A paper describes a structure:
Despite the crystallization of full-length ApoE4, we could only obtain ApoE4 NTD structures (residues ~ 22–165), but with well-defined loops conformation. Although our four new ApoE4 crystals belonged to two different space groups (orthorhombic P212121 versus trigonal P3121), they shared similar crystal packing contacts. Two NTDs (chains A and B) formed a T-shaped or V-shaped molecular building dimeric unit that stacked with another adjacent dimeric unit, resulting in an elongating crystallographic fibril. While the angle between chains A and B in the T-shaped dimeric unit was ~ 100°, the corresponding angle in the V-shaped dimeric unit was significantly smaller ~ 75°. This ~ 25° angle difference between T-shaped and V-shaped packing was retained in both the orthorhombic and trigonal space groups. On the other hand, 5 of the 7 ApoE4 structures have V-shaped packing, indicating an ApoE4 preference for this packing pattern. The C112R substitution in ApoE4 led to the formation of a new salt bridge between R112 and E109 and the repositioning of R61. Consequently, the helix H2-H3 interaction between R61 and E109 observed in the T-shaped packing was abolished, and the four-helix bundle was destabilized. The “domino-like” effect of the C112R mutation was further exacerbated through the H3 helix up towards Q123, which directly influenced a tilt between chains A and B. The side-chain of Q123 was oriented upwards in the T-shaped packing, while it was rotated downwards in the V-shaped packing. The upward orientation of Q123 in chain B was stabilized by interactions with W39 and T42 of chain A. In contrast, the absence of this interaction in ApoE4 structures resulted in a tilt (~ 30°) between chains A and B and the subsequent formation of a geometrically distinct V-shaped dimeric unit.
Human ApoE is a 299-residue protein component of lipoprotein particles and a key regulator of Aβ aggregation and clearance. The three polymorphic isoforms of ApoE, i.e., ApoE2, ApoE3, and ApoE4, differ in amino acid composition at positions 112 and 158. Compared to the least frequent isoform ApoE2 (C112/C158), the most common isoform ApoE3 differs by a single mutation (C112/R158), whereas the AD-associated ApoE4 contains two mutations (R112/R158). The ApoE protein comprises of the N-terminal domain formed by a four-helix bundle (NTD, residues 1-167, helices N1, N2, and H1-H4), followed by the hinge domain (HD, residues 168–205, helices HD1-HD2), and the C-terminal domain (CTD, residues 206–299, helices C1-C3).
Author numbering: 23 to 165
The structure:
């Protein structure tokens, strides 16, 4: 894949592990290591995506200009959606950390069930937006 796709792939691999919510995951969630790592992986994905779009603009098919503008704005919106989705994942995990830190030594099982359900929905959104972004990038040059 492209550099940005490999960066997103590392985000996916790390998130899949987090979604197991094992005791190893819990340790890294409560220390903030998980959200620092997701921030790093998100930032790298977005940096590579912006650089990729910039290089694609060196190999464009000429089109009506109105069309090129439309497609460029649609692509920028798709990039922004991806970044917002990754940040929503990270923010939901920050929320979980704060809730666990407020509850002394009480059982986190219900919190974990609710987190797992929510993360599944956030992953669905990130995945549909990533696939949409790849579709737009694939037809961007031909216009």
């Amino acid at each position: 894949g492209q550099r940005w796709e490999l960066a997103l792939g590392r985000f996916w691999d790390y998130l899949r592990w987090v979604q197991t919510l094992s005791e190893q995951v819990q340790e890294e969630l409560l220390s903030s290591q998980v959200t620092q790592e997701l921030r790093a992986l998100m930032d790298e994905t977005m940096k590579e995506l912006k650089a990729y779009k910039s290089e694609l603009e060196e190999q464009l098919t000429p089109v009506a200009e109105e069309t090129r503008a439309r497609l460029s704005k649609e692509l920028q919106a798709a990039q922004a959606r991806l970044g917002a989705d990754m940040e929503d994942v990270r923010g939901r995990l920050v929320q979980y950390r704060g809730e666990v830190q407020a509850m002394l030594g009480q059982s986190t099982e219900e919190l974990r069930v609710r987190l797992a359900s929510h993360l599944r929905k956030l992953r669905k959104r990130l995945l549909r937006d990533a696939d949409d972004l790849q579709k737009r990038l694939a037809v961007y040059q031909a216009g």
